[PDB]
Amino acid sequence: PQITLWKRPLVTIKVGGQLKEALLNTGADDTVIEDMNLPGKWKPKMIGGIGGFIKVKQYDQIIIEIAGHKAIGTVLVGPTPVNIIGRNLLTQIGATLNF
Amino acid sequence: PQITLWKRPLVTIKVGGQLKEALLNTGADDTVIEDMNLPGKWKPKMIGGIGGFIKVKQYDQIIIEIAGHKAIGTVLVGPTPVNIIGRNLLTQIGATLNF
Amino acid sequence: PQITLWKRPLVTIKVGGQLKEALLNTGADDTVIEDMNLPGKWKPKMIGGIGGFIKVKQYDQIIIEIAGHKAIGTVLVGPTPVNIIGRNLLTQIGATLNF
Amino acid sequence: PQITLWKRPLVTIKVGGQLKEALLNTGADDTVIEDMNLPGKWKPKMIGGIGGFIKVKQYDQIIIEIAGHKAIGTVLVGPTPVNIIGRNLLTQIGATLNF
Numbered sequence: 217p218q219i220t221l222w223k224r225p226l227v228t229i230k231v232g233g234q235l236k237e238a239l240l241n242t243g244a245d246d247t248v249i250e251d252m253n254l255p256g257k258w259k260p261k262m263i264g265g266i267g268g269f270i271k272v273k274q275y276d277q278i279i280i281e282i283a284g285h286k287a288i289g290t291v292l293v294g295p296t297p298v299n300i301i302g303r304n305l306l307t308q309i310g311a312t313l314n315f
Numbered sequence: 316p317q318i319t320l321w322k323r324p325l326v327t328i329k330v331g332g333q334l335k336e337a338l339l340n341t342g343a344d345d346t347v348i349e350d351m352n353l354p355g356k357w358k359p360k361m362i363g364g365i366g367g368f369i370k371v372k373q374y375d376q377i378i379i380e381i382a383g384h385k386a387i388g389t390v391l392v393g394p395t396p397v398n399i400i401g402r403n404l405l406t407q408i409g410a411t412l413n414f
Numbered sequence: 415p416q417i418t419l420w421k422r423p424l425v426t427i428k429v430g431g432q433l434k435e436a437l438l439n440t441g442a443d444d445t446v447i448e449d450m451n452l453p454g455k456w457k458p459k460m461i462g463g464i465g466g467f468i469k470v471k472q473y474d475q476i477i478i479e480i481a482g483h484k485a486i487g488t489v490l491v492g493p494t495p496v497n498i499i500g501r502n503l504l505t506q507i508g509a510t511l512n513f
Numbered sequence: 514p515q516i517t518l519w520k521r522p523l524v525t526i527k528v529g530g531q532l533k534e535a536l537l538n539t540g541a542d543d544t545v546i547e548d549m550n551l552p553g554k555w556k557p558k559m560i561g562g563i564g565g566f567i568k569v570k571q572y573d574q575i576i577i578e579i580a581g582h583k584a585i586g587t588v589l590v591g592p593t594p595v596n597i598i599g600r601n602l603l604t605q606i607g608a609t610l611n612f
């Protein structure tokens with residue numbers, strides 16, 4: 217798609233077999249999604265940004281569909297108010313910024 | 316140009332007559348710049364990042380150049396580790412996210 | 415051996431009971447072999463090369479012989495144009511880089 | 514020096530007068546450096562790996578300091594997450610893979 221930026225870049229994702237909404241975030245290194253029940257092994261990690269850091273669960277090699285594009289990679293699960301797709305999965309689906 | 320997301324999409328900006336490096340961010344409408352002495356009228360605002368909420372100063376109709384492309388708009392100034400260009404200004408330079 | 419690099423460092427490997435040719439790669443974390451029917455359980459994975467990501471099958475604890483050296487480790491199977499031996503298995507044959 | 518392969522084989526390099534870290538890569542024909550401003554004439558070229566090919570700037574006769582050893586030859590500049598030193602320069606500094 218050609219995602220425009222007049223509105224929030226919202227897409228449907230599928231994680232843990234469940235459909236959710238998420239925000240495509242070129243300004244995030246990582247992918248972090250709202251606390252959820254997710255199958256798979258995980259380990260603790262901190263991730264940061266404005267206002268400081270939050271503690272999350274780091275799940276490796278998680279299957280996740282982004283607007284119908286398949287990715288399998290690292291998904292952080294924690295206290296974010298919004299599901300954000302970051303560069304680790306944006307690169308997997310071949311996303312670029314263009315102007 | 317086209318910018319892959321293998322690395323943070325950092326570009327040079329000009330704001331307040333100064334050159335800075337800034338991150339192109341589809342994930343926020345707001346633009347936030349690290350503390351600096353901009354002239355003119357301002358109002359305080361509270362904004363939320365992943366780690367919590369911060370206080371910024373909001374400056375309106377600020378001239379800003381992004382990767383050589385002219386823009387004018389609202390700039391927030393406060394405690395951010397990285398200069399962040401949000402959707403407000405990204406739309407002015409004709410940026411889209413493509414995959 | 416002491417392998418000089420005027421040609422690709424290609425060697426014979428044995429995996430799945432089959433002989434194959436593969437490239438010794440200090441630049442790769444993982445080992446990737448062209449699609450083939452290995453027996454047993456596997457996990458999906460996506461790995462990122464210079465031209466993008468490919469989906470692969472991750473087989474763990476796989477018997478593999480590399481240039482006459484026995485090894486046991488993780489082998490990824492998918493659409494690589496060239497069979498690649500990565501650092502995971504290069505450490506088992508005791509490969510070091512000298513200059 | 515002699516490097517084991519338990520960690521990524523990163524060394525300090527100098528190219529265009531700038532210090533950078535790069536990966537010593539026996540599994541790469543060519544030397545590919547992340548997009549940067551580099552003086553000199555170049556021509557477009559495609560180079561490939563896992564996932565396909567990318568478009569790069571091919572600079573001839575570029576000087577590159579690799580962990581203190583001088584090497585001169587073809588240097589490709591393009592959209593990669595990692596700087597890699599390939600066989601074309603590894604041969605020049607006498608690099609071998611030993612096991």
Ligand SMILES: CC(C)(C)NC(=O)[C@@H]1C[C@@H]2CCCC[C@@H]2CN1C[C@@H](O)[C@H](Cc1ccccc1)NC(=O)[C@H](CC(N)=O)NC(=O)c1ccc2ccccc2n1
Pocket residue numbers: 241242243244245246247263264265266296297298300302338340342343344345346347362363364365366395396397399
């Ligand atoms: C910029 C502002 C207006 C405050 N909006 C936001 O920050 C919103 C808030 C939303 C609700 C909370 C959870 C995140 C979403 C998305 N974010 C935008 C979102 O794009 C945000 C922008 C950003 C980038 C870099 C540094 C700071 C802030 N990115 C992030 O929060 C990601 C999170 C991550 N670990 O991937 N942070 C980083 O990628 C990042 C990069 C460098 C850093 C250096 C030092 C300290 C922290 C650093 N964090």
Ligand SMILES: CC(C)(C)NC(=O)[C@@H]1C[C@@H]2CCCC[C@@H]2CN1C[C@@H](O)[C@H](Cc1ccccc1)NC(=O)[C@H](CC(N)=O)NC(=O)c1ccc2ccccc2n1
Pocket residue numbers: 437439440441442443444445446461462463464465494495496498538539540541542543544545560561562563593594595597599
């Ligand atoms: C194997 C995997 C786990 C996916 N990791 C990687 O591929 C990482 C990714 C990193 C980030 C992007 C930039 C490259 C680095 C280093 N690479 C490893 C790196 O060692 C990689 C391994 C490889 C060799 C041959 C064929 C495919 C892949 N080599 C390369 O990507 C180099 C690039 C070059 N032109 O010099 N490719 C080749 O030397 C090469 C040789 C023969 C080929 C035949 C057909 C198609 C492509 C071919 N590419």
